[PDB]
Design a protein around this nucleic acid. Structure first.
Lengths: 73, 77
DNA sequence: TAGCGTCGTAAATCATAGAG
DNA sequence: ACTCTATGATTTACGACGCT
């Protein structure tokens, strides 16, 4: 059967958000850094690239909505 | 604070994205399989036929080759 | 320089998981 | 189940750099 898209588990999201926020002034992981995140999260490098693309634009589009999340991290 | 300040930004003069139609997509896909690399003339004819600029056609083919790369990387684990 | 190639990404849009 | 909308994925359009 075809693989279905799925929301990432809480674990993967925490790892990605951790990296994103710790590099907030320039959240652009290098290819080697995307491979390691991909490993810790159990996802693919394309998926890490998609997550960062999605995160930067949505965060940039709504700074307020992502506040508080910026702090806990 | 503006933490997004140093991030990559789209130049305020970039053409706004226009999804192509099922028809334009299907026709471009068929031109792709005929020759994965366009000649100045084939590009010119496909562009006219679909009412897309030659630039848009050149870029569509470039993006299509990157999609092929993406799919093949997804397969050869 | 002109001009087409790849790589990586921005931003908009898609598809449908999943949450009420 | 049945909307909605959140989120991962895909599609246009380029900038930066390669080479001839």
């Amino acid at each position: 059967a075809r693989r279905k898209r799925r929301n990432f588990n809480k674990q993967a999201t925490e790892i990605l958000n951790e990296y994103f926020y710790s590099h907030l002034s320039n959240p652009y992981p290098s290819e080697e850094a995307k491979e390691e995140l991909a490993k810790k999260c159990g996802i693919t490098v394309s998926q890490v690239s998609n997550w960062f693309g999605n995160k930067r634009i949505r965060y940039k589009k709504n700074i307020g909505k992502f506040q508080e999340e910026a702090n806990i991290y | 604070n503006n933490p997004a300040a140093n991030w990559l930004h789209a130049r305020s003069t970039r053409k706004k994205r226009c999804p192509y139609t099922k028809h334009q997509t299907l026709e471009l896909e068929k031109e792709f399989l005929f020759n994965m690399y366009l000649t100045r003339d084939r590009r010119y004819e496909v562009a006219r036929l679909l009412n897309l600029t030659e630039r848009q056609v050149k870029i569509w083919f470039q993006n299509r080759r990157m999609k092929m790369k993406k799919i093949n990387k997804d397969r050869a684990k």
